């Protein structure tokens with residue numbers, strides 16, 4: 449029925465410096481919103497400590513940009529347990545960049561999401577087709593296969609901590625945002641699939657966010673679509689306009 | 699010639715928590731090392747901040763366990779520039795776990811090392827052959843090709859900030875503890891290659907660290923080997939025992 453609580457998530461990706469983030473964080477702290485909205489900021493692992501120490505806005509949660517399922521002999525990686533111990537309860541998993549550059553198959557992503565949910569994390573699970581896949585008319589087949597791989601490892605209860613982020617690969621950092629119709633069409637497909645497998649309530653309460661060239665200028669029109677519950681913001685999240693994007697979820 | 703300054707590096711891998719690392723750090727801080735030695739601790743990115751704010755032992759430098767060549771749209775990753783801005787001047791690259799689980803090829807490792815050196819970092823370059831490769835009699839071909847790949851991208855002057863770590867992946871991967879003799883067998887060929895391809899000066903100043911199983915029990919015997927200049931320690935580097943391992947390089 450009515451839309452669940454919206455989410456405005458910032459993916460700073462592999463960017464940042466203390467001198468840059470300090471002022472940015474202060475802007476976030478001074479920002480107020482008159483509607484219920486879950487704001488999220490995902491710094492690089494290296495910047496999580498300074499962010500957690502400085503960010504005070506209660507409507508904000510800190511998320512890691514990735515994580516592996518187990519602590520151990522995995523040089524260079526950061527596990528969910530390590531993040532949990534540090535007080536981080538949100539995490540982005542399966543980002544297109546990780547599926548494409550760092551060998552994250554649908555199954556690997558699913559294992560990550562499964563362990564994250566079991567660990568009590570709110571997970572922003574990313575899905576999305578490439579330009580070639582959309583041109584070949586494989587969009588639905590692709591995103592449903594990505595989502596299905598994850599769902600198969602989750603229990604019914606786990607969905608209360610699951611968030612889906614649809615980011616068409618052709619819309620990431622290209623300045624070519626999906627039209628409201630294009631986004632709505634996929635969000636519908638995703639939610640309808642979830643409903644067929646998990647029921648009315650879970651499908652209705654599920655937040656499905658759009659990501660890919662989202663800006664303060666195109667955010668409002670996108671958010672008004674019936675099946676869009678917020679955004680995963682890349683480039684514009686490291687700018688002051690990110691506050692306007694949040695306001696766009698009112 | 700005499701051995702150059704030894705290095706005792708701790709690779710904490712994907713392990714750590716405030717409760718574990720604080721006591722260990724203060725234990726390292728309390729220890730006093732009378733000889734010339736470069737100590738290194740490589741915490742996960744998440745723990746680098748607490749380590750930098752707490753580590754005081756004068757013999758220590760803090761290193762990252764990995765890094766990518768550039769900042770940008772690489773969700774989950776940390777770039778060399780972000781680390782440098784944070785004040786981290788040491789980095790481990792090409793560790794077997796990344797070459798095996800995260801598809802880091804010789805070219806990828808070589809490129810990372812080249813940009814690292816260009817960025818002014820001291821780099822611990824990891825090389826090593828698997829059990830299969832060793833059983834096929836390919837130890838030399840494998841490790842030297844890995845080393846050659848990185849060597850081709852560097853200039854002679856860069857080696858002053860390069861460090862090689864030999865990982866007997868064949869031993870680690872089979873749950874075995876390589877003997878000082880098996881360790882030295884590879885260090886001998888590694889230095890022979892460096893001596894003939896890069897120069898007598900480079901070979902004499904180059905630290906070639908043993909990255910196999912090192913504990914307070916076998917550290918001294920390993921360091922006694924002619925071509926071993928220290929270690930890249932695993933599990934034991936997370937224990938107070940690491941103090942004795944460092945002392946074994948005297």
Ligand SMILES: O=S(=O)(O)CCCSc1nc2ccccc2s1
Pocket residue numbers: 518520
């Ligand atoms: O060479 S293989 O690909 O068969 C094994 C590589 C070791 S990676 C892994 N190590 C552990 C250890 C405990 C639990 C789960 C895992 S996955």
